[PDB]
């Protein structure tokens, strides 16, 4: 599924993401935007380390979800990576919350530092009623 901007904003608010671990909804929106373009079935193979990024938040298979083919893999979140390709993003949200529970917070995603950190992120939630 490819979410509409405001549709996603409201869904994330309803799932308790606004202010989760000090992270505003606008920042989570900025992350999803640059990570997948609000696309739940987005996948990205990292040829260099043989891991794959799954879903709307591009969660990596070496640490957060299990896909069986990732060398030296860990399953901190404890999810099957398949769960992160569903239209219903409840599992991708529980996974995302787990990622930010580590000291890096939202900085775990390099894309966040590149295009979200220290920018005006209001544009991602303006007009959505959240």
From Swiss-Prot:
Catalytic machinery residues: 35, 53
Subcellular location(s) per record: Secreted
Described purpose of this protein according to its UniProt entry: Lysozymes have primarily a bacteriolytic function; those in tissues and body fluids are associated with the monocyte-macrophage system and enhance the activity of immunoagents.
PANTHER family the UniProt entry points to: LYSOZYME C (PTHR11407:SF28)
Related illness: Amyloidosis, hereditary systemic 5: A form of hereditary systemic amyloidosis, a disorder characterized by amyloid deposition in multiple tissues resulting in a wide clinical spectrum. AMYLD5 primarily affects the viscera, and the predominant clinical features are renal dysfunction of varying severity, and intra-abdominal bleeding. Inheritance is autosomal dominant.
Q: Which UniProt keywords apply?
A: Amyloid, Amyloidosis, Antimicrobial, Bacteriolytic enzyme, Disease variant, Disulfide bond, Glycosidase, Hydrolase, Secreted, Signal
Please give the name of this protein: Lysozyme C
UniProt-listed CDD domains: LYZ_C
Is Amino-acid biosynthesis found in the keyword set? no
Reactions catalysed, semicolon-separated, are:
Hydrolysis of (1->4)-beta-linkages between N-acetylmuramic acid and N-acetyl-D-glucosamine residues in a peptidoglycan and between N-acetyl-D-glucosamine residues in chitodextrins
Q: Which cysteines are joined by disulfide bonds?
A: 6-128, 30-116, 65-81, 77-95
- Does the record carry Secreted as a key word? yes
Name the gene. Answer: LYZ
UniProt lists the family membership as follows: Belongs to the glycosyl hydrolase 22 family.
Q: Which GO terms describe its biological process?
A: antimicrobial humoral response; defense response to bacterium; defense response to Gram-negative bacterium; defense response to Gram-positive bacterium; inflammatory response; killing of cells of another organism
Pfam family name, one: Lys
